[PDB]
Amino acid sequence: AANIVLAYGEWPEYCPDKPTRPDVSVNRFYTLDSKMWQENSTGWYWKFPDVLNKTGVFGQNAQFHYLYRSGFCLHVQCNASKFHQGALLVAVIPEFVIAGRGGFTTTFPGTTGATFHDPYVLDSGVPLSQALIYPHQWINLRTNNCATVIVPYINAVPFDSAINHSNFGLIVIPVSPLKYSSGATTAIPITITIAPLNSEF
C-alpha cells in the first residue's frame, strides 16, 4: 500500500548551481527508539536535522560542514491489534518553535524527542484544529497503520548550519485517545524512520 504526501508538492532536489553529495551509508534508513503510547498520553515531537546530530555517519557529516542541505523521507508505523481504537495526527511544521508557558532541551530534544504539555495549543500558542494546513497524514487504527511524508529542503537561504538551526519538526499528536478492552496490550508502539534525500555538506 503506497500512499505518500509530498510536502507542498516539490520533490527534494540538489541545489541549483563544491559541496559533497555522499551516498554509501549516508543515505539509508535510520530507525529511532519506539514511543510507547498509552491512554493518558499527550504526544510527541522531533526536531530536524537535530535528531540526527549524533547518529551513524550522518551525525559525523552533520558535524563540521557548517553548510548543510538535504530533504527527507519520513515513514511512521503503528503496530496495533484490530481491537485497539484511536487516531494520530502526523504533521510537519517548518520552523517549529516551542514557546514558554509562563530551554535548549525544548528547542533541541535530541534523538528521543519530547512530549507536549498543552497539545491543544501545540505549545506554540496556536490552535491545533488548524494544524491541518501543514503537510500531514492521518493514522487511524481503523484503516491505515502507517503514514509517509516527503519533505523537500525548505529555508530562506540555500544553506545553513545544522547544529545551531533546526529547519522544521515532526509531530504525532493523538487526537482520539487510545481505547481498548481489558486484557489487550496496554501500550501501542510508534516507529519512526528517516531517510535523508539529496544531502549536501
Q: Give dist(CA 73, CA 105) in Å, integer.
A: 25
Q: Quick check: 113 binds another protein (CB under 8 A)? A: no
> Cell 539529496 maps to which residue?
198
Q: Quick check: 22 binds another protein (CB under 8 A)? A: no
Q: Enumerate residues 70-89 that contact another protein by CB under 8 A.
A: 77, 79-87
154 in the Ramachandran plot: left (φ > 0), alpha (ψ -120 to 50) or beta? beta
> Cell 557529516 maps to which residue?
61
DSSP 117: S
Binder of another protein out of 62, 74, 76, 128 (CB under 8 A) = 128
| 86's grid cell | 484511536
| Minimum gap (Å) between residue 198 Cβ and another protein | 19
Class of residue 13 by CB neighbours under 10 A (exposed 0-12, middle 13-18, buried 19+): exposed
Q: Is 94 helix (H, G, I), strand (E, B) or coil?
A: strand
Provide the mask over 31-70, with x wherever binding to another protein is found by CB under 8 A and - wherever it is not: x-xx-x----------x--------x-------x-x----
Beta carbon nearer to another protein, 4 or 184: 184
Q: Give dist(CA 152, CA 132) in Å, integer.
A: 18
Q: Give dist(CA 180, CA 141) in Å, integer.
A: 12
Q: Enumerate residues 136-175 that contact another protein by CB under 8 A.
A: 138, 140-143, 154, 156-157, 161, 164-167, 169, 175
| Minimum gap (Å) between residue 132 Cβ and another protein | 5
Beta carbon nearer to another protein, 21 or 42: 42
Q: Enumerate residues 170-199 that contact another protein by CB under 8 A.
A: 175-176, 179-185, 187-189, 191
Beta carbon nearer to another protein, 35 or 199: 35
Beta carbon nearer to another protein, 22 or 56: 56
